[PDB]
């Protein structure tokens, strides 16, 4: 489909674990902070370099009701000296571009071609809706016909302080059908 050949990288491939070598049964899995209609995944304090690193921090966002708004916060490099120097986020074009599992690897997909009727506002408060500024947002539509799963990454595992290593953030947005 055209418009996809112009916005996504068809050659991109990654995995949930990345280069951490941690299997999913050893992830630190936890649920998003859900308040009213807003489900939030905040990695502000989850990814700092630790002795045991690299760890995988997976935030699970489970949606089965309409008009839910998802906010994801990924600390910027420089926010705290030394701790996020090598932090990276994927896709760079989030939330317009997301990762979906094709076969057994994560590849790029346009979120608007995945959850139709989605709303992505260009701004988050006064900021740009992009991990470049530290936070992304999108609002799911009143109706979803099919189960959908897509991922975001906020990886500080390549950052090293002392002998400590940062953790790898993962967001899984599991949108079960709703609205009939």
């Amino acid at each position: 489909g055209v418009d996809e050949l112009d916005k996504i990288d068809l050659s991109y491939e990654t995995t949930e674990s990345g280069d951490t070598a941690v299997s999913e049964d050893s992830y630190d899995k936890y649920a998003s902070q859900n308040t009213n209609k807003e489900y939030v995944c905040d990695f502000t304090d989850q990814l700092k370099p630790t002795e045991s690193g690299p760890k995988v921090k997976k935030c699970e966002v489970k949606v089965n009701e309409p008009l839910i708004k998802v906010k994801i916060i990924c600390p910027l490099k420089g926010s705290v000296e030394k701790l996020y120097d090598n932090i990276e986020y994927v896709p760079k074009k989030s939330p317009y571009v997301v990762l979906t599992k094709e076969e057994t690897k994560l590849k790029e997909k346009l979120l608007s071609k995945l959850i139709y009727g989605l709303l992505i506002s260009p701004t988050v408060n006064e900021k740009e809706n992009n991990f470049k500024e530290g936070v992304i947002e999108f609002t799911l539509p009143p109706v979803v016909h099919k189960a959908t799963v897509f991922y975001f990454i906020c990886d500080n595992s390549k950052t090293e302080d002392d002998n400590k290593k940062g953790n790898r953030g993962i967001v899984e947005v599991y949108v079960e059908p709703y609205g009939n």
Partner: single-chain antibody, 226 residues
């Protein structure tokens, strides 16, 4: 070592113009949106304008729409605010404030501008003796607090607002655990435990308003430590 330094302030005749500038240090300027907030003498905080990292999206308050223009040069770590057709109502300290995950997290000392020849609701006063747990409340509408997290500022007179609570209940590094914030529906409040004389100051709540497309502040509450 993040610092924001304004300049250009001074005395302007009613109807004149003035160019404010703010120069940034200590952080990647290209990764941060910027704001201008103004405080008239004796009054509270009023958001003026915002500009995104890439200058792709500018936003203004209707107080200043048509007269004010925000710009930035990231090669010069520069933020700018041209102010035209000024009025006595525009008399205020003009802070440049870096945008945070919630409300703006770092502020400059402010440029004094003198021109001479929808809101959050806070209690006007709050008081308590040392050691007590005092409460300051904040209420709004569904366009702001009904769909956006609250933030809390502490301003000692003569200095810039200091961020205490962002994103409802998060504390910036260096803020004691005795400060905590809660929020429910269109209501919110700030809790200050172990109250001490060092807390005697004004406190503002802040949240985004989707209808206004800008930051809204509370009128402010003066906390006196008895």
């Amino acid at each position: 070592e993040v610092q924001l330094v304004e300049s250009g302030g001074g005395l302007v005749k009613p109807g004149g113009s003035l160019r404010l500038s703010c120069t940034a240090s200590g952080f990647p300027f290209t990764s941060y949106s910027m704001n201008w907030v103004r405080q008239a003498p004796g009054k509270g905080l009023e958001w003026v304008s915002s500009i995104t990292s890439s200058s792709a999206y500018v936003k203004y308050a209707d107080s200043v729409k048509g007269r004010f223009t925000i710009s930035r040069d990231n090669a010069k770590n520069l933020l700018s605010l041209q102010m035209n057709s000024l009025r006595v109502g525009d008399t205020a300290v003009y802070y440049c404030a870096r945008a945070g995950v919630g409300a703006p997290d770092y502020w400059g000392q402010g440029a004094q501008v003198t021109v001479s020849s929808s809101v959050l609701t806070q209690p006007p006063s709050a008081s308590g003796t040392p050691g007590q747990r005092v409460t300051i409340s904040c209420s709004g509408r569904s366009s702001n607090l009904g769909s956006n997290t609250v933030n809390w500022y502490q301003q000692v007179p003569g200095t810039a607002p200091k961020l205490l609570i962002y994103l409802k209940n998060q504390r910036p590094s260096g803020v004691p655990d005795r400060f905590s914030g809660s929020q429910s529906g269109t209501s919110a409040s700030l809790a200050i435990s172990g109250l001490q004389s060092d807390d005697d100051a004004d406190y503002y709540c802040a949240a985004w308003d989707d209808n206004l497309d800008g930051w809204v502040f509370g009128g402010g509450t003066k906390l006196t430590v008895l």
